[PDB]
Structures are given as C-alpha cells and as structure tokens.
Design an enzyme around this catalytic site. Structure first.
Site, PDB file in Angstrom:
ATOM      1  N   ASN A 186       0.707  -1.269  -0.143  1.00  0.00           N
ATOM      2  CA  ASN A 186       0.130  -0.042  -0.009  1.00  0.00           C
ATOM      3  C   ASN A 186       0.909   1.325  -0.064  1.00  0.00           C
ATOM      4  O   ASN A 186       2.168   1.347   0.234  1.00  0.00           O
ATOM      5  CB  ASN A 186      -1.049   0.111   1.143  1.00  0.00           C
ATOM      6  CG  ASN A 186      -0.364  -0.250   2.625  1.00  0.00           C
ATOM      7  OD1 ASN A 186       0.639   0.499   2.820  1.00  0.00           O
ATOM      8  ND2 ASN A 186      -1.427  -0.427   3.470  1.00  0.00           N
TER       9      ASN A 186
ATOM     10  N   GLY B  67      -5.684   2.938  -0.857  1.00  0.00           N
ATOM     11  CA  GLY B  67      -7.027   3.003   0.199  1.00  0.00           C
ATOM     12  C   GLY B  67      -8.317   3.466  -0.847  1.00  0.00           C
ATOM     13  O   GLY B  67      -8.674   2.651  -1.818  1.00  0.00           O
TER      14      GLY B  67
ATOM     15  N   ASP C  75      -4.538  -8.804   1.025  1.00  0.00           N
ATOM     16  CA  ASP C  75      -4.240 -10.108   0.718  1.00  0.00           C
ATOM     17  C   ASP C  75      -5.266 -10.611  -0.244  1.00  0.00           C
ATOM     18  O   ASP C  75      -4.935 -11.351  -1.212  1.00  0.00           O
ATOM     19  CB  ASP C  75      -4.422 -11.283   1.909  1.00  0.00           C
ATOM     20  CG  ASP C  75      -3.161 -10.826   2.751  1.00  0.00           C
ATOM     21  OD1 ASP C  75      -2.146 -10.330   2.592  1.00  0.00           O
ATOM     22  OD2 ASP C  75      -3.367 -11.151   4.224  1.00  0.00           O
TER      23      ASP C  75
HETATM   24  N1  LIG Z   1       4.188  -8.881  11.299  1.00  0.00           N
HETATM   25  C1  LIG Z   1       3.383  -9.720  10.575  1.00  0.00           C
HETATM   26  N2  LIG Z   1       3.953 -10.543  10.245  1.00  0.00           N
HETATM   27  C2  LIG Z   1       3.238 -11.721   9.582  1.00  0.00           C
HETATM   28  F1  LIG Z   1       4.022 -12.632   8.855  1.00  0.00           F
HETATM   29  N3  LIG Z   1       1.926 -11.814   9.345  1.00  0.00           N
HETATM   30  C3  LIG Z   1       0.982 -10.775   9.719  1.00  0.00           C
HETATM   31  C4  LIG Z   1       1.704  -9.659  10.389  1.00  0.00           C
HETATM   32  N4  LIG Z   1       0.897  -8.896  10.833  1.00  0.00           N
HETATM   33  C5  LIG Z   1      -0.182  -9.441  10.291  1.00  0.00           C
HETATM   34  N5  LIG Z   1      -0.150 -10.354   9.805  1.00  0.00           N
HETATM   35  C6  LIG Z   1      -1.138 -11.404   8.850  1.00  0.00           C
HETATM   36  O1  LIG Z   1      -1.531 -10.667   8.056  1.00  0.00           O
HETATM   37  C7  LIG Z   1      -3.092 -10.173   8.154  1.00  0.00           C
HETATM   38  C8  LIG Z   1      -3.740 -10.267   6.882  1.00  0.00           C
HETATM   39  O2  LIG Z   1      -3.122  -9.226   5.839  1.00  0.00           O
HETATM   40  C9  LIG Z   1      -3.694 -11.486   9.044  1.00  0.00           C
HETATM   41  O3  LIG Z   1      -4.396 -12.345   8.709  1.00  0.00           O
HETATM   42  C10 LIG Z   1      -2.357 -11.681   9.876  1.00  0.00           C
HETATM   43  O4  LIG Z   1      -2.495 -12.926  10.534  1.00  0.00           O
END
Ligand SMILES: Nc1nc(F)nc2c1ncn2[C@@H]1O[C@@H](CO)[C@@H](O)[C@H]1O
Ligand SMILES: Nc1nc(F)nc2c1ncn2[C@@H]1O[C@@H](CO)[C@@H](O)[C@H]1O
EC number: 2.7.1.20
Lengths: 331, 331
Positions: free
Chosen positions: A203, A233, A265
């Site tokens: 983003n 956004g 995602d």
């Molecule tokens: N610092 C982070 N490191 C990793 F590996 N994963 C993370 C982090 N912060 C958020 N998440 C995951 O991303 C979210 C959806 O984008 C969520 O589903 C979440 O599980």
C-alpha cells in the site's frame, strides 16, 4: 533457466499462517496521536469487541486463490493445531502438503485493533512461524513442479530472504509482498527482497516506509522489478511499469467498512488469479478490487463468500459491462 | 461532610484488575510512524517475546501499597478466575473483600507491545471489568469505614464517573487517575472526573491529551484540584499547586530499562503511601520514584521486590542522606 517440469499453473504462496484475534476501538487512533509525543508513544485502547478468525497472509491469499478456482500450494510453518485449519483450507481446494508442522511450537498469533476510520495497530507473535526458515522451496518444486509464481509474503524474516534466494536460484518468478513485515525488517533486509521481482505489492504507506528505510528512490526500485502494484485505500490502485506507464483502477464502492484485515491479501489473490488467467493489468486489478471489498465488508479475512452472479453485477456497477463480462468469463 | 467512622488510614483503590500479556518489539515504533500517514496508521509489529503477568491499574497500585506496608482495599470487577490472583494480593496485605466477581465474564485482558525506547502500544479487553459500574462505594464504606483517599484509576468508563460521583456525595477525598483510559474517554467524560480531586495524576503526554480533549487550559484545571502530579519520563515529576508553586523531583537512575508497564502505578502507590505517612510532597515523590524504577527494572508490574536496606542506599544515591533517612524511617 530451470529445466524441471512446469507445475502449471500453480501459485505457491509463502508467508504466515496464524490465528487472528481482531478487536474494535470505538474511537479514532489519529485523535490520540499527538505529533509532539510520537517520539515515544504511550497508547492503550479500550476495545469493545474481540473475535478470532483464521489468518496469516499466506493462509489468506491461498484461501482466496482457491475460492476463485485457482491451483495453489500453501507453504509456511504452523503448530500441531494446524490439522483443523488444514481442513478449512482444503475445502476450498488449497494444497497444504508442504506446510511444515512444528513438533513443539504454537501457530502464530496476530492481535489487532481497528478504529472507526479502519486504521489498525497490531502485534504478531511468531511461534511456529519461525521454523519457516527450515522449509526448502526446492523440495516443494521437486514434488509439484515449477510454480508459475511464488508469492513471498510476510513471514519469518530470515525465511522471507531464504525463499527469495531460492526463487532466484531456481529461476522461479516471484512477487515481493513484504507488506506486514516492513516494520520489523531493516533497510538492508528490505533491499535484498526486491531485485528481479515480477511484482512488488504494497500500500502507499508501505511504499513510503520501504523507500524511507531502503534509502532508495522510486527509480532505484523500478529498475529492479517488472511491475509495482501500490494500493491507495479509497483511491484504488496504481500499477506502474518500469517506463513508468501507470494504469490506475479505482475501488469497488463499499456498502460497509466492517473490518479491513486481509483486504490487501484478497486484492493480491484476485489480481494474481486474474493475471494467471491471461487478463491484462487493468482487468486483473478490477477483479482484485472486488475480492478486496468483499473482505472489507466481512469480519475476518476468509469469511467472505463468492457468488458468481453477485460478482458480475458489482463489477458492472463499478467498471461497466465490458470489464464484468471479460472478468467473469475468465473464471 | 460525612459523619460515618474513619477507616483510618485505608486507601481504597478503584480501577482495573487484569491479566497482562506483555511482548517486546526489537525496533522503534517512532521509526515506523510517518508523520504524513498518522491520519490512518497501518502498523504491525513482529514481536520476539510474550509473557503473562498479573495486572490492572488497581491490582498494581493495591499490590504496591501493600508491599510498602499500607492498609489498602482493592475495589474492582474480575472473573471467576480471580481466586488465584486474590491469594497473590492477600499475601501482600491487600484487602480483596470488595472485588466484584462476575458470574459469567472473564477477567480483563491487556495485550501490550513495548519497543526498544520503552514506547508502548496496547489494547485492553474489558470482560468482567464492565461490571465495575455495579459496585457501590457506599457499601465498601459501610463495611470498612471512610477511606482517607479513594483512587479513581482507569476502569469501566461508566464506573470511573459513578465512583467519582459517589466520592463527591460521600465526602471522600479522591485522586483522579484516568491515565490509561484517556484515549477512550470523550472530553465530556474526562471533564466530569476532575472537579474537587485531591490529586490529579498523569504523565505529560496524558496531560496534553487531557487538555487537548477537554478544551481546558492548565488554569481551568488547577482551579478545580488540590494538586497536579505530572510524571516526566526520564525528567522526573512535577508537583504543582493551584498557586502554582511547583516542586520537581528527578528520577532514581535506572540500571536497566527492562519493561515500563506499571511504572506510573508504582510511582502513584509509593507517593500516596508517602503522603499517608505524613511525608511532604518532595519526599513522597522521592519514595514514589524509587518504587517506579524498581518496576522499570523488572518484567511485569508486580514482579519487583522490596529490600529495606537496598531502598535506603538507592535513595541516598539519588537524593542524598536526608531524603533517604526521612523516607525509610516513615515505613
Ligand atoms: N508482522 C506480521 N507478520 C506476518 F508474517 N503476518 C502478519 C503480520 N501482521 C499481520 N499478519 C497477518 O496479515 C493479516 C492479513 O493481511 C492477518 O491475517 C495476519 O495474520
Ligand atoms: N485502557 C485501559 N483500561 C484499564 F482499565 N486498564 C488498563 C488499560 N490499559 C492498560 N491497563 C492496565 O494498566 C497497566 C499498568 O499501568 C496494566 O497492568 C494494565 O492491566
């Protein structure tokens, strides 16, 4: 140039596998954040809601690719508790054979707070995720053939680089998607994830952070990647070529802003699904924007539904009849 | 003017009772926080540590008053799981008879992330805390007599006002200590907690936030309270009279900055303990500053120890021989 057989047309999704605890703060984080105290914040938000959902960037992206009918392998590390989450993913066509299951550590935990403006502040406890550095993409490729694309999502920081290095030596196309980890990674750690990327996804805040920490200019980045994808956004998404020819696609208008977790995602999974099916950049981002708003309108990252008729109608509404028909008749 | 018997010399501590989950981010929150994106943050911190400890501002303050030998009643709402936490508090002389135990809800959960600069970002899930609005201070006073002071700490927002109103109608001296809840409370909600307070306690960020959200000037506040106590991080603490005569006390130098959770709570408990024992403002803040640094040097809020000889020596080191002897020979 790799001579091994093509998996065709599999996307391998690397990145985190977690349980997400999502909470809502019925106020504005901005209204708390005195510019003169940002040197050392002391913030505590009384929340009015706490719910648990399946998460992790790689679980989220694999789920969406599977819902959309794509061939997808999930590659990441989880705790012994993963059996149930595996069934949920398998139900949407996700190949979970290459998930490393820790003998001793727990599935990662994300604890996230969202305010009335959809701003978010979160911690991520890795647990079993740290063992992702022990996964060899070579062994995955051995079993299923060469993926058409490997997504390098937020993960164990060392794993993110090791996976990227493996893609580079195996000649696999990869998408650099460091988003969620940019806060933890040093400028050196970010810089080594970028060169040769088929796509770089962030983003616009993350893009500023990346440039801020790498010491790079936009030009430095564009010279190393095939395409920059920067979500904006409520302003949609920019797709920028090294040229830099820019294609812009506006959002699909929301009926609610429920919970923004996993929206990026979902955009990535829809977009890449579009790309895999031979749609162009504009059409792929239009499909992406739809999966994105479906996530925004639901609580949790994988709690959205895919109604083929509802999709065509919405796509028509935001982008017109041509876009809708081209997209739907690719799925 | 209340004619009921004096509890003498009990402090009643109202505020939260929780389990704290404390995590460490091995980076700087400041370095993530682009001034131009503070309008809508999107922050996620990969943490390298997660530990659980007894917490809640009222548990923390009651614990410290009890360790220091003070007579103290803990007044707040907890879940059925509270029996074990009750034993831990009772072991340090805390009266837990007036804790409301929820029949259905869970003890509150604090999830906190601390960075390398001791900055902190946290969520607080209330659970059983929300039932604190059903506690009547009148019934507590009925049982133990009139406290010399009621501390109004962060709590169920409605409970904070109801407790304050009860103090006002029962003629009980109170300390407004809204610190941890300032983010959640509206300017209207903050304004109604302040008038007639024996003490107002905050740190300087919180003081700016308070003034920012109340629309008040410092003068507006000073006209309503007997004393403002504003902690200044590494710069110590200001004690300001309506005059405003200001007494300043510098920190007790730390040997580590381990975990800053509960440092404010400890300062307040030591200070108020000092005040209760007839020490003046300067000496009370010197004792407070010591309990404060003992918390800073340990992980968790109630994991510090009280060594009478070590205390005198440290107090001597930072404030000189007079301060140390006056303080120790009050305990
Ligand atoms: N610092 C982070 N490191 C990793 F590996 N994963 C993370 C982090 N912060 C958020 N998440 C995951 O991303 C979210 C959806 O984008 C969520 O589903 C979440 O599980
Ligand atoms: N928003 C909040 N509301 C309430 F009532 N309590 C909170 C809040 N944030 C932190 N805490 C508690 O304060 C800490 C120590 O100061 C911790 O011990 C923690 O339990």
């Amino acid at each position: 140039e790799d001579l091994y057989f093509q998996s065709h047309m599999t996307i391998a999704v690397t990145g985190s596998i977690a349980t997400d605890h999502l909470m809502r703060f019925p106020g504005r984080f901005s209204e708390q954040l005195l510019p003169e105290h940002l040197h050392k914040v002391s913030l505590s938000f009384l929340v009015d809601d706490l719910v648990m959902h399946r998460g992790g960037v790689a679980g989220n992206m694999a789920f969406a690719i599977g819902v959309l009918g794509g061939e997808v392998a999930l590659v990441g590390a989880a705790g012994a508790d993963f059996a149930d989450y595996r069934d949920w993913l398998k139900a949407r066509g996700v190949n979970c054979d290459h998930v490393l299951i820790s003998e001793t550590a727990h599935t990662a935990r994300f604890t996230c707070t969202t305010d009335v403006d959809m701003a978010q502040i979160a911690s991520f406890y890795p647990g079993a995720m740290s063992e992702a550095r022990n996964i060899k993409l070579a062994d995955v490729v051995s079993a299923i053939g060469k993926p058409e694309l490997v997504i390098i999502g937020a993960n164990d920081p060392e794993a993110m680089f090791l996976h990227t290095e493996e893609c580079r030596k195996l000649g696999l196309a990869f998408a650099a998607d460091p988003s969620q980890q940019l806060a933890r990674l040093s400028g050196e750690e970010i810089r080594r994830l970028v060169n040769g990327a088929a796509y770089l996804f962030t983003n616009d805040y993350e893009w500023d952070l990346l440039l801020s920490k790498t010491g790079w200019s936009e030009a430095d980045v564009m010279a190393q990647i095939d395409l920059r994808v920067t979500t904006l956004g409520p302003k949609g998404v920019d797709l920028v070529e090294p040229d830099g020819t820019t294609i812009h696609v506006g959002v699909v208008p929301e009926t609610s802003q429920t919970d923004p977790t996993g929206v990026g995602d979902a955009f990535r999974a829809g977009f890449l699904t579009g790309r895999s099916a031979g749609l162009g950049l504009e059409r792929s981002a239009q499909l992406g924007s739809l999966v994105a708003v479906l996530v925004l309108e639901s609580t949790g990252t994988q709690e959205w539904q895919w109604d083929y008729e509802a999709a065509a109608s919405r796509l028509a509404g935001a982008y017109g009849e041509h876009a809708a028909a081209e997209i739907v008749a690719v799925l």
